[PDB]
Ligand binder design. Sequence first.
Ligand SMILES: O=C(O)c1ccccc1Nc1cccc(Nc2ccccc2C(=O)O)c1C(=O)O
Ligand SMILES: O=C(O)c1ccccc1Nc1cccc(Nc2ccccc2C(=O)O)c1C(=O)O
Lengths: 342, 342
Amino acid sequence: PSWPQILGRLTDNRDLARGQAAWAMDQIMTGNARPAQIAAFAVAMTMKAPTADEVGELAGVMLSHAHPLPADTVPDDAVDVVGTGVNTVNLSTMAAIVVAAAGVPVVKHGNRAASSLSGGADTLEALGVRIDLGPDLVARSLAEVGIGFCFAPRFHPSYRHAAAVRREIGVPTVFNLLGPLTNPARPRAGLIGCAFADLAEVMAGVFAARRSSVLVVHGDDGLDELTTTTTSTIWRVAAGSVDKLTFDPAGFGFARAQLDQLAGGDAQANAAAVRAVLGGARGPVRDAVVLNAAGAIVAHAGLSSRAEWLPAWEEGLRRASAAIDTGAAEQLLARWVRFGRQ
Amino acid sequence: PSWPQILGRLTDNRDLARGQAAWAMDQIMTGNARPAQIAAFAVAMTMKAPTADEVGELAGVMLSHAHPLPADTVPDDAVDVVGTGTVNLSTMAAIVVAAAGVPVVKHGNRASSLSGGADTLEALGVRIDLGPDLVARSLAEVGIGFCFAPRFHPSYRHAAAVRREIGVPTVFNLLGPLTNPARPRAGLIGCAFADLAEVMAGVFAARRSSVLVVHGDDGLDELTTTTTSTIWRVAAGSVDKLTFDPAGFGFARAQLDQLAGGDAQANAAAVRAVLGGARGPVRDAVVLNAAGAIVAHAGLSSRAEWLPAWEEGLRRASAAIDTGAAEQLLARWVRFGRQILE
Ligand SMILES: O=C(O)c1ccccc1Nc1cccc(Nc2ccccc2C(=O)O)c1C(=O)O
Ligand SMILES: O=C(O)c1ccccc1Nc1cccc(Nc2ccccc2C(=O)O)c1C(=O)O
């Protein structure tokens, strides 16, 4: 294999041969790829339209270079809640806290962002959470708080050349999919949002080849989370298969919201919204947080429970609303801040 | 304008807004574009499918940074013999064209491709790395000049390095033929990529050039007696797509193996053989490409019938060899180069 061979196949709009994506990713992860090569590959893979097999190789090779959490410190039923990217870091941050407050272990994965729009880590820091912890400490956090956060650069140091290139070019590429696919705690369940229906289906394919119970979701308004402004598409993944469906939260009594109402802002704006919602403020933002938290709980249930789709959603919505209303979510955040200060 | 804006537009498979391609090119040419940004742009433009207006902007900006030849030193009816993407044939055809009395100014880099020939010329004793003044003097005294690409386009160095690192053909392959620093108004222009060839024809049309753009129906960027060819005949600002069959002129069909290349010294030997009157498929191919350039040259001063123009072009190319004129011109060219020292 070589760059001219792989790049040529992509620019010819052809799927790669098995092993080629992995070769490219390993070159990237080992410092052997020139920045021009990295960028050409990222762009060509994006414009060709990546397959699940290709993205599975990229993520898999990336994971092989990552630091893991210590042996047996991640509960078998840990979940992630995240979107691939305007962003909904506000929503996924709140949902994660609500989910952990409902009693489900959560482990997230993220970085500080250059943008005025908050990355995952930025909003959490604004809330007083300590985001850059080593594997042993992330593990303690999980055991004692029921939530943990893996700071991407610490857990994926060998991804530094790819990350640099991605910032240099700015444009979204297939590499934007790797974050939720490379959570170093390797949780087996989750709610994973994607802004593009076609890439969502590709990610669901990747999760299907893993031992996973996941809802990959796409708002039909383009949101990378379950939306309340219209329907969403859900790729339900369990036991190596995928069940794709149209989902409508009006069936659970959610009023229709407007897109402008749900969008995240900078870290400080987000932190303010988090305090209002966890303190009980009603509105479109709470509704979307509850909806996505419930979705993550439904995914979690798929790991063990044999509860069917509809009663799982009903219980998921009950648990998520209750985690907010009883102050459990506000208390968990405070406990999370305490853990860091100590 | 910014990279995320431009690259985002291309990955969404949209044509650029006017001036966006020019902006990207000025960044590249001024040393302000990162290798990753150059590569991303090169690949994205290629996969979107470049328009004539876009390539025109790239070429126009690149030209603006090039060293020009001194004023009034390039004959109004000069032609190029050039290509992008076997024994070198461009050097021979160019020599035969000049020997037929048509001024030739070639644009080239340091094999096989019509663009090439620099190594072959060096092997024959011709001085190829000359500044603008001496290229002009060569045109006046010998009837042919060679613009060494790196010499005339120093600011393209960042782009050139990136193209080598990625090693895949891109829209940047078109720029060579479109940025001859002497700016001849006529030419025979080869293109190995049928898609890109029509685009290149469109740019020559916009410039009001008289050009034949040729694509071997076998991926050769030059005419041969192997198969039929596609020719875009460009004149009067308009483009006509034509099939071209050498057999229709009495040429026997040859095998590509008979055009096998070798080291620069092998190409030198083939040149000497052909200019000395040796018959065979190499001569036939040289005569075809030369005649093509002569037909393009005729297009500058008159609308001419396709098959008659070709017959006369073929006869003129043949006589240039058989009179000893081509062999003599090559010797005069070498002699000129040797006079420089004194
Ligand atoms: O980039 C993403 O979309 C992303 C999303 C969620 C989690 C991680 C993500 N990316 C990364 C995943 C692992 C490492 C990342 N970055 C770095 C890696 C090594 C050294 C430095 C960095 C850095 O960005 O500072 C990065 C990154 O910033 O792009
Ligand atoms: O690359 C082509 O297809 C091409 C074809 C015909 C004429 C020129 C061509 N390219 C170039 C046109 C201008 C400059 C070129 N290269 C360089 C520019 C500055 C410094 C060094 C170089 C170099 O290639 O060494 C190059 C190049 O070799 O890629």
